[model samples]
Target chain A: GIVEQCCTSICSLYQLENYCN
Target chain B: FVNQHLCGSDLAEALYLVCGERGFFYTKPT
Candidate 1:
């Protein structure tokens, strides 16, 4: 079985920026 | 250089830590 997996990358650098403050 | 190279969104060295992003060593960075 050589099937590949599809995955998504979540860039959390923006969520940690605290821009609403 | 002690207070640098650790910050910054940064530059790239172009190696591999993850495989199959391309057909070779492609998902690498600095």
Candidate 2:
């Protein structure tokens, strides 16, 4: 079986207050 | 540069579920 696995991405900097406010 | 990509709660939940079944790499901030 051929399965293509890859990683999903998310940005942590958005959670920071500096980025939000 | 980092704040560009943001994951919503619903999307994260979906990703969690999909990863559980399909198999994918992801990170959750603590």
Candidate 3:
């Protein structure tokens, strides 16, 4: 669902430990 | 931030539900 907005990973953007979470 | 980037409301809500089912919190970016 999360569309990559930039080069930065979505996990980092969400301050999440992992994308699967 | 994730809400702004997510593709669709349906998918976003679905994932939100799944996270809840899994007992995970969807923490928004600061």
Candidate 4:
């Protein structure tokens, strides 16, 4: 649960980029 | 002031497994 949150943050940034793009 | 925080790859392997083989983020060219 905790560690997953960190990885999620990274991919979230990646997702945000593509969505913004 | 984007400093030495993201390298972890192309510089080191810690952030490089899925990253070491996949991507390394940078602000890109000016």
Candidate 5:
């Protein structure tokens, strides 16, 4: 499974916003 | 950047999953 977190985390190291199609 | 300092690089995230979240439960580091 993909280990991902919410954008609210604010972890700018890796932006997840719109990362998925 | 956070990855090099407080975040400890992208590899750090996987560690949290194996253990717990950061700045909350997984503040302990190597």
Candidate 6:
């Protein structure tokens, strides 16, 4: 849970970082 | 800073809820 949800998933990992390239 | 994303959930909404999540019916939220 990212240390108990890191700030709502940091915007869900920045929107999956453009689908991880 | 912000990225785009949406939200949704209800993966069957308790999938039978121990045979209680009712199905075959939804005329309305009684």
Query: Total backbone clashes of model 1?
Result: 0
Quote the lDDT for B20 in model 6: 41
Q: Measured against the native two-chain assembly using Cα atoms, what DockQ does each of the candidate structures obtain, in the order listed? A: 0.04, 0.11, 0.18, 0.05, 0.07, 0.04
Off-target runs (Cα >4 Å) in candidate 6 are A1-15, B1-5, B9-30
Candidate 6 has which clashing residue pairs, if any? Answer: A1-A5
> What are the per-residue Cα lDDT tens digits for candidate 4 across B1-30?
112222323222323432544564433322
Our model 4 lands, by Cα RMSD against the true structure, at 11.5
What is candidate 2's CA lDDT for residue B22?
48
Cα lDDT, all candidates: 0.19, 0.34, 0.38, 0.31, 0.33, 0.26
Question: Could you give candidate 5's fraction of true interface contacts?
Answer: 0.07
* Model 4 segments more than 4 A misplaced: A1-21, B1-11, B26-30
The sequence of per-residue lDDT tens digits that candidate 6 reaches over residues B1-30 is 243222221111212221243341212112
lDDT of 6 by residue, A1-21 (tens): 222233233334343232222
lDDT of 2: 0.34
Name the best candidate (by TM-score): 3
Q: Give RMSD (Å) of candidate 6 vs. truth.
A: 15.0
Whichever of 1 and 3 has more DockQ, that candidate is 3
> What TM-score would each prediction reach against the true structure?
0.14, 0.26, 0.28, 0.21, 0.22, 0.15
Instruction: Say which prediction, candidate 2 or candidate 5, comes out ahead on DockQ.
Output: 2
Q: TM-score, chain B only, every model? A: 0.13, 0.38, 0.38, 0.21, 0.30, 0.14
lDDT of 2 by residue, B5-30 (tens): 33455344434443445444344433
List, in order, the clash count of every candidate structure. Answer: 0, 0, 0, 1, 0, 1
Give the clashing residue pairs of candidate 5, or none: none
What is the lDDT, from 0 to 100, of the residue B16 in candidate 3?
Answer: 56
TM-score of the second chain of model 2 compared to its true counterpart:
0.38
